[PDB]
Amino acid sequence: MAQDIISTIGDLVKWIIDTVNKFTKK
């Protein structure tokens, strides 16, 4: 449960960091 939610938020964070390092906000 909490570990899987945190792991999933980490996986979202990977995509946010990729998308950020690409477009660091435009």
Place of tokens 């938020």: 9
Place of tokens 């945190």: 6
CA 14/CA 22 separation, integer angstroms: 12
Element spanning 14, H or E: helix 2-22
CA 8/CA 16 separation, integer angstroms: 12
CA dihedral 12, 13, 16, 20 (to 10 degrees): -170
CA 18/CA 5 separation, integer angstroms: 20
Residue ranges of domains in the chain: 1-26
CA 15/CA 5 separation, integer angstroms: 15
C-alpha triplet 15, 18, 19: angle, nearest 5° = 80
